[PDB]
Design a protein around this ligand. Structure first.
Ligand SMILES: [Zn+2]
Ligand SMILES: [Zn+2]
Ligand SMILES: [Zn+2]
Ligand SMILES: [Zn+2]
Ligand SMILES: [Zn+2]
Ligand SMILES: [Zn+2]
Lengths: 167, 185, 171, 331, 131, 86, 144, 48, 56
């Protein structure tokens, strides 16, 4: 490791997919193995978070429409988390009211769907979080999609994404 | 002298005029150091080109800045806050932006209406500065020779009948000494 | 945006927890000092994944403190905002200086200058709301906001968003 | 009570990287531009904004806060201001070092007087440690009085291989007071030519020395460049470094550093006004010398052959070097 | 209107990096520098004297032909040929029908270019899209 | 971790040094003063230093000494495995 | 018309305002007299020079003189350059007046308080439109 | 406000707190006045 | 080295040469007010979980 002083750094900007220094495409985990940046859409993030909470609840104990699921998450949240959880409560509440894919099967289909484009993890996560009806909407809401995927593929991908929308 | 000073000094800082000091030995007087003034065209043109570019660039940047969101200022401590900086100071009621030093509500800044005036200023300047741009275009096509005190002396029109200054350049013999900016290509 | 990140923390244990069950206390400290916290470098640290398999390294006794300093490596789900990104949220507060949108653990502030011209603030209506010919923006309303700027401090993140561009605003 | 809690991690200093301030860094670090040689306004109730004791540089009073960090005397470390010097001046502690670099490079193109085409310099450049490599290079280059546009090739001395040069004869540089004076010796056909090497001229030359050239001389690309040995922007230490004592508290005294910093400002403004309009070159050079002397004595008041800065009581002014050295100094 | 942005009066001599773009909506020349500052935040009215037609930054493109009028005709031609598109085989080698079809398409393009009957012609373009 | 010498090739002394004993006693004494769980039986003792001495005598100090080498490598030695003979 | 930047010491616990405060200088403490809570610790009690900000205002200046080793050439020229400063010229007139007032007051065998008042009277009454057609001798004599 | 900033470096997330004698702080600031940059770093760049 | 003699001259040469001080000597740690790597400081004290679990 050599000297370091002020160098000009690329200002963070999602439109340019310049996510910064710690959110680069190529990441290094705790084992030193190379990995890709794991970006989650709202539905994927909701499943991942609540999958860990149930396991956490299992650890301590051993040693559906929108409203009922919201209450079930709320009661589980308070039981399985420590203090100063004011942020996680808002997060779980926000993920249940803004998710488009309910169960694992629906989310799994989305992942197997959008990985054929070869887009950036940030872009695919955005395409699974925002409901866009026309290719133009996705081209302006995600400026990075411009000149990466043709309107022919985007139009059909959006149609299939809207296809597997519960309720 | 007290009035020629400021004029020569400013025309020298902008490099529209060059200076040349040399020792003179009148046959019947104490040796004196004389100062001559001439114009080094390559130097003046570069200064003009740079200044023209900078003035336009500053106005263009001011147009860009003035088209951005306004910002904020504190009436008491006269400290400006940007839109991003002000959003981390708002009170618990989410009603007003509070200052950090004074803990006082912030006041919206000016420059909202100048969006048109700055464009008007740029529209005027390029019209007024047109001859310089047209002259520089013709200058770039041709190649100007750098001027020197001796070279300038070839076009001299004597000012007076009996000027004390000897308008001649008799360089010292075998003088390896080189002064800064005293040689031309 | 939600990422799964590999994070490291330095936890300190008071000598009162130097017992046969100190690893459990380190796990409790991690869930109480990391979960729900905000870092300007990694965003809001929301959930710790694999709570059973955190890597606890050997602790170093601090010279004069007497406490043990543990480096802890864990996998967490973190929400990091980025400028130029489009998010959805619910309005929580409205005022003369614009409204605030709640997006997960973050609050985005939409200023008047980053709103369309037709929208106007109407304090007469209770609750106060922004009214225009096509839509009304009020508390609990759903707004699609494009983050225009992010200022990240070591323990706080504040962002400003806009609804001027097309396909933004009321959903 | 103790100091307030902080969210920053607590760490131990592992390394100390010494170096020189760049003019850009001094301006970026600065919280205020000092432009008034006073300390209090006309009312003597508050500190003058833009003066020496600007409230933005910190506070040394138990009753006032810092206008920058809003913290008390026991938490504010002090914040640096800067003074933009009208003309570049030498660093009194580097004049000898500056002189040695001048004798090593060409004073017209900034290129080392001897390239790798010379066997002796090849051995010199093969020395690992910076200090002795510089000494070896200086011992070789200080006697080279020409730039040698063309140099003999290393395969055979028959034909000459061209190197970047200009063919101008180098001067013999000597230190007279706080100025560097060079002398050019004539050709076959009397007294050598003499003139003063301006600090601006030397700064211009030091900015032309290539990265690989001054790394051979022991300078660091990132932390110490020979151009930075000439002072263009002066860092103004915060009041904590120069506190204002009271004897009866109806009388006010200022630190010796504040007196010298005021001198620098007054000499700086005098030079600015002079050269702005008229100011025959003799008057300007006198003003520059005064500015150089004040800056030099502000840092070190014990200079061989120079006069000493004196308080009105007549005792020598205590400089920064005087505070750091001795059995009673900082160390 | 020679080599400089009519709005910012940024001459090419002092800014050689200047680059112009056009918007199909009104085909008004504008340098890239003005596009970012006027349209980055969102849609806004064209910054021209006498033009009040709103446009978006995402629509700007580079002018291909040095004649603006031909650019308008070609772009309209591209729009129509994306809808009205057939071949000689589409009429089973009937040249008379094909030539009449070609003449009708040219008439449609001519009307759309000069605004003779914008409403009826535009509806016809929309209608044929379904068929 | 190339700087952690495996336990099978440690070449340092198997004896506690005077400085190691002094810091271990001071380190554990400070912890005891801060209500740390004592792993030795007290037959009547209130001074943290004396309690630490009792723990060292009975080898009940759960600390290890990271002996550093002039090249940056280190060896880990448990207080229980170190001989206290000085 | 400026930032407050004022620190007031009060006891957070007692909450009584204004508070009873004792300065234990020997212990370096500021303590609440009622509860004993310490409010500020590590309080502070030649390297500088003194001046009177009633006869000289705000004017920091330094002389130039010989040292243990010095050449007369540098001293003469530095004094020559220092004298030609345009800003310090204005106040030198007042200082010159002070010098002559001191000489007159000293030749009169007058106490130091007399000359201090005389100099202060000169400074306060100087630089005004009323006393511009009067000789400096009258000004000095009146001030004395 | 739990805010840190080093203007000139344009950073707010790379700050550390160290415990040094106030004379050491005074020494470094005096060196800064002499145009010297004593840069304190919390990690090593070269091996022993 | 500046602790012995010629303090300021040494520090100026350190600045011009951009010397790196690794703070392995007693004087550097004394100046920085941190535990020197001598005597009781020539080693680190870590906590042992493997022994903590078996001491109960
Ligand atoms: Zn304020
Ligand atoms: Zn401060
Ligand atoms: Zn040369
Ligand atoms: Zn333009
Ligand atoms: Zn238009
Ligand atoms: Zn009290």
């Amino acid at each position: 490791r050599r000297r370091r002083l002020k160098k000009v750094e690329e200002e963070e900007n999602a439109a340019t997919l310049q996510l910064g220094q710690e959110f680069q495409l190529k990441q290094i985990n705790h084992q030193g193995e190379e990995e890709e940046l794991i970006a989650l859409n709202l539905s994927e993030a909701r499943l991942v978070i609540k999958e860990a909470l149930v396991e956490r609840r299992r650890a301590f104990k051993r040693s559906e429409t929108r409203e009922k699921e919201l209450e079930s998450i709320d009661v589980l949240l308070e039981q399985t988390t420590g203090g100063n959880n004011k942020d996680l409560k808002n997060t779980m509440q926000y993920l249940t009211n803004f998710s488009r894919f309910r169960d694992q099967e629906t989310v799994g289909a989305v992942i197997q769907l959008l990985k054929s484009t070869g887009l950036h993890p940030f872009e695919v996560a955005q395409l699974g979080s925002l409901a866009c009806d026309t290719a133009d909407e996705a081209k302006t809401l995600i400026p990075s999609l411009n000149n990466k995927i043709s309107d022919d593929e985007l139009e059909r991908i959006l149609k299939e994404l809207s296809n597997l929308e519960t309720l | 002298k007290t009035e020629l000073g400021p004029l020569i000094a400013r025309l020298r800082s902008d490099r529209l005029i060059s200076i040349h000091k040399q020792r003179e030995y009148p046959p019947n007087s104490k040796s004196v150091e004389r100062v001559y003034y001439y114009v080094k065209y390559p130097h003046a043109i570069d200064a003009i080109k740079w200044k023209v570019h900078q003035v336009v660039q500053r106005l263009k940047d001011d147009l860009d800045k003035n088209s951005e969101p306004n910002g904020y200022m504190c009436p008491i401590c006269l400290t400006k806050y940007t839109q991003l900086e002000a959003v981390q100071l708002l009170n618990f009621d989410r009603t007003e932006f509070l200052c950090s030093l004074c803990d006082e509500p912030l006041v919206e800044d000016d420059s909202g209406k100048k969006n048109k005036e700055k464009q008007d200023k740029l529209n005027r300047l390029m019209d007024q500065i047109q001859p310089i741009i047209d002259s520089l275009k013709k200058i770039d096509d041709s190649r100007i020779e750098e001027n020197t005190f001796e070279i300038a002396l070839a076009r001299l029109i004597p000012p007076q009948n009996q000027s004390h200054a000897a308008y001649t350049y008799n360089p010292k013999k075998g003088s390896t000494m080189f002064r800064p900016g005293d040689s031309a290509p | 945006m939600f990422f799964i990140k590999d994070l490291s923390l330095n936890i300190t244990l008071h000598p009162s927890f130097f017992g046969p069950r100190m690893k459990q206390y380190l796990k409790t400290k991690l869930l109480e000092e990391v979960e729900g916290s905000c870092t300007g470098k990694f965003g809001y640290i929301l959930c710790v994944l694999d709570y059973d398999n955190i890597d606890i390294q050997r602790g170093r006794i601090l010279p004069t403190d007497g406490s043990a300093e543990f480096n802890v490596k864990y996998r967490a789900v973190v929400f990091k905002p980025f400028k130029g990104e489009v998010v959805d949220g619910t309005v929580v507060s409205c005022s003369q200086h614009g409204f605030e949108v709640q997006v997960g653990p973050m609050k985005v502030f939409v200023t008047k200058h980053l709103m369309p011209q037709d929208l106007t603030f109407n304090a007469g209506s209770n609750p106060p709301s922004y009214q225009s010919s096509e839509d009304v923006i009020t508390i609990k309303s759903r707004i699609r906001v494009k983050i225009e700027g992010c200022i990240s401090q070591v323990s706080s993140i504040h962002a400003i968003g806009s609804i001027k561009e097309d396909y933004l605003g009321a959903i | 009570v103790g100091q307030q809690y902080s969210s920053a991690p607590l760490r131990t200093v592992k390394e100390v990287q010494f170096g020189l301030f760049s003019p850009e860094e001094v301006r970026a670090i600065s919280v205020a531009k000092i432009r008034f040689p006073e300390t209090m306004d006309e009312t003597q109730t508050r500190a003058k904004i833009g003066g020496l004791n600007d409230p933005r540089l910190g506070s040394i009073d138990r009753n006032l806060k810092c206008q920058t960090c809003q913290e008390g005397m026991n938490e504010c470390p002090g914040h640096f201001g800067h003074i933009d010097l009208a003309k570049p001046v030498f660093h009194v502690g580097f004049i000898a070092k500056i002189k040695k670099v001048c004798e090593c490079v060409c004073m017209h193109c900034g290129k080392l007087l001897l390239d790798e085409h010379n066997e002796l310099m090849r051995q010199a450049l093969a020395i690992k440690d910076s200090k002795k490599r510089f000494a070896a290079i200086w011992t070789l280059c200080k006697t080279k009085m020409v730039c040698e546009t063309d140099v003999p090739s290393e395969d055979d001395p028959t034909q000459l291989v061209s190197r970047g040069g200009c063919g101008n004869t180098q001067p013999t540089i000597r230190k007279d007071g706080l100025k560097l004076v060079g002398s050019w010796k004539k050709d076959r056909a009397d007294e050598p030519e003499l003139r003063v090497l301006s600090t601006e001229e030397i700064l211009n030359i030091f900015k032309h020395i290539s990265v690989k050239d001054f790394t051979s001389l022991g300078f660091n690309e990132v932390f110490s460049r020979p151009e930075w040995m000439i002072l263009t922007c002066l860092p103004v230490p915060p009041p904590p470094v120069r506190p204002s004592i009271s004897f009866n508290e109806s009388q006010r005294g200022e630190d010796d550093l504040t007196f010298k910093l005021a001198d620098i400002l007054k000499a700086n403004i005098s030079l600015e006004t002079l050269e702005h309009n008229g100011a025959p070159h003799h008057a300007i050079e006198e003003a520059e010398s005064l500015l150089q002397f004040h800056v030099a004595t502000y840092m070190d008041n014990d200079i061989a052959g120079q006069p000493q800065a004196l308080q009105k009581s007549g005792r020598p002014v205590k400089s920064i070097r005087a505070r750091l050295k001795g059995k009673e100094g900082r160390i | 209107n020679k080599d400089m942005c009519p709005i910012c009066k940024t001459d090419r001599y002092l800014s050689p990096d200047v680059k112009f773009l056009v918007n199909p909506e009104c085909y008004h020349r504008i340098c890239e520098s003005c596009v970012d500052r006027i349209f980055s935040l969102g849609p806004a009215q064209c910054p021209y004297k006498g033009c009040d037609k709103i446009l978006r930054k995402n629509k700007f493109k580079t002018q291909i032909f040095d004649d603006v009028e031909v650019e308008k005709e070609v772009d309209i031609r591209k729009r129509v040929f994306n809808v009205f598109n057939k071949t000689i085989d589409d009429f089973n080698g009937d040249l008379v029908e094909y030539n009449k079809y070609l003449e009708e398409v040219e008439d449609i393009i001519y009307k759309l270019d000069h605004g003779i009957d914008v409403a009826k012609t535009e509806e016809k373009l929309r209608t044929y899209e379904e068929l | 971790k190339e700087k952690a010498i495996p336990k099978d090739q440690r070449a340092t002394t198997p004896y506690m040094t005077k400085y190691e004993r002094a810091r271990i006693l001071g380190t554990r004494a400070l912890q005891i003063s801060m209500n740390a769980p004592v792993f030795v039986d007290l037959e009547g003792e209130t001074d943290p230093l004396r309690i630490a001495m009792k723990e060292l005598a009975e080898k009940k100090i759960p600390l290890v000494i990271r002996r550093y080498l002039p090249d940056g490598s280190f060896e880990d030695w448990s207080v229980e495995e170190l001989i206290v003979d000085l | 018309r400026g930032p407050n930047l004022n620190i007031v010491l009060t006891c957070p616990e007692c909450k009584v305002y204004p508070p009873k405060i004792v300065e234990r200088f020997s212990e370096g403490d500021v303590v609440c007299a009622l509860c004993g809570l310490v409010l500020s610790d590590k309080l502070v009690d030649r390297v500088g020079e003194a001046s009177n900000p009633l006869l000289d205002g705000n004017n920091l200046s330094t002389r130039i003189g010989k040292g243990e080793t010095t050449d007369m050439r540098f001293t003469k020229e530095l004094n020559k350059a220092q004298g030609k400063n345009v800003m310090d010229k204005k106040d030198n007139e007042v200082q010159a007046a002070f010098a002559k007032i001191t000489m007159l007051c000293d030749a009169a065998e007058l106490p130091k308080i007399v000359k201090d008042c005389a100099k202060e009277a000169y400074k306060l009454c100087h630089d005004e439109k009323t006393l511009k057609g009067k000789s400096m001798e009258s000004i000095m004599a009146a001030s004395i | 406000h739990n805010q840190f900033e080093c203007k000139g470096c344009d950073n707010k997330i790379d700050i550390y707190q160290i415990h040094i004698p106030y004379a050491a702080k005074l020494l470094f600031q005096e060196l800064m006045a002499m145009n010297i940059t004593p840069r304190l770093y919390t990690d090593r760049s070269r091996d022993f | 080295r500046c602790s012995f003699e010629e303090t300021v001259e040494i520090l100026f040469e350190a600045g011009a040469s951009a010397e790196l001080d690794d703070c392995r000597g007693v004087s550097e740690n004394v100046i920085l007010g941190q535990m020197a790597p001598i005597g009781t400081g020539a080693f680190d004290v870590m906590i042992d979980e493997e022994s903590l679990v078996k001491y109960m």
